[PDB]
Design an enzyme around this catalytic site. Structure first.
Site, PDB file in Angstrom:
ATOM      1  NE  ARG A  83      -3.862   2.346   1.864  1.00 13.59           N
ATOM      2  CZ  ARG A  83      -5.035   2.436   2.471  1.00 13.59           C
ATOM      3  NH1 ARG A  83      -5.448   1.425   3.212  1.00 13.59           N
ATOM      4  NH2 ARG A  83      -5.798   3.509   2.324  1.00 13.59           N
ATOM      5  NE  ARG A  93      -8.223   2.272  -1.285  1.00 11.22           N
ATOM      6  CZ  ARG A  93      -8.619   2.995  -0.241  1.00 11.22           C
ATOM      7  NH1 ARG A  93      -8.881   2.414   0.920  1.00 11.22           N
ATOM      8  NH2 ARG A  93      -8.751   4.309  -0.367  1.00 11.22           N
ATOM      9  CG  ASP A  98     -11.375   0.788   6.737  1.00  6.18           C
ATOM     10  OD1 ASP A  98     -10.200   1.203   6.736  1.00  6.18           O
ATOM     11  OD2 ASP A  98     -12.243   1.191   5.930  1.00  6.18           O
TER      12      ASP A  98
END
Ligand SMILES: Nc1ncnc2c1ncn2[C@@H]1O[C@H](COP(=O)(O)CP(=O)(O)OP(=O)(O)O)[C@@H](O)[C@H]1O
Ligand SMILES: Cc1ccc(C(=O)CSc2nc3nc(N)[nH]c(=O)c3[nH]2)cc1
Ligand SMILES: [Ca+2]
Ligand SMILES: [Ca+2]
Ligand SMILES: [Ca+2]
Ligand SMILES: [Cl-]
Length: 159
Positions: A83, A93, A98
């Site tokens: 990334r 990405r 998350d």
């Protein structure tokens, strides 16, 4: 132990390969065990639309790590999977991990905000979450089933 729910996204550099590698890496996080993996979904991009479709998924990870220690690992995994930070807001990405929920905890630190600030407005987060945790209740008492019953979201297509 606490169950953390992690959203996975990838739209660069062979998303299926990225997500499979990420799942192996998540397993290797210490003090932690994967309980459940959702189906993989192919989702149209939210935000800027001039990027490839995403592979989105969700994982339930049982853990005794502190929330920011879990974040340390998820950030490490993203970086180790190539990334790169560019200037454009919400661009494509290789891997995005998350932390959606960390048990029933409400966390507001400099590095970490949980529940994820916008998850209740994103079908690509809520549908895979419902697949793995249909009984889920948010820290504010809202039921995942009730959100998905009431609010308009497009159905997700599997990858
Ligand atoms: N619940 C959470 N999960 C992961 N990172 C979080 C987080 N809450 C805050 N962060 C912080 O978010 C910072 C920026 O992350 P980014 O991945 O660039 C945002 P994004 O995922 O592209 O958009 P989004 O947050 O609108 O989904 C991280 O460096 C991390 O410190
Ligand atoms: C209005 C708005 C809503 C959501 C978002 C984002 O999700 C942030 S960047 C992003 N777009 C995405 N679209 C999809 N389908 N999947 C993602 O993981 C993903 N990540 C950005 C803007
Ligand atoms: Ca482990
Ligand atoms: Ca994200
Ligand atoms: Ca992120
Ligand atoms: Cl810890």
């Amino acid at each position: 132990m606490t169950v953390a729910y992690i959203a996975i996204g990838s739209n660069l550099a062979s998303p299926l390969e990225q997500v499979n590698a990420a799942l192996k890496a998540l397993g290797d996080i210490p003090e932690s065990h994967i309980l459940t993996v959702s189906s993989f979904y192919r989702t149209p991009p939210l935000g800027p639309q001039d990027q490839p479709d995403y592979l989105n998924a969700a994982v339930a990870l049982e853990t005794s790590l502190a929330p920011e220690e879990l974040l340390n690992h998820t950030q490490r995994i993203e970086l180790q999977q190539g990334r790169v930070r560019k200037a454009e807001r919400w661009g494509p990405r290789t891997l995005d991990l998350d932390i959606m929920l960390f048990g029933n905890e409400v966390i507001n630190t400099e590095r970490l905000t949980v529940p994820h600030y916008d998850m209740k407005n994103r079908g690509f987060m809520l549908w895979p979450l419902f697949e793995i945790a249909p009984e889920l209740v948010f820290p504010d008492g809202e039921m995942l089933r009730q959100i998905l019953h009431t609010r308009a979201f497009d159905k997700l297509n599997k990858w």
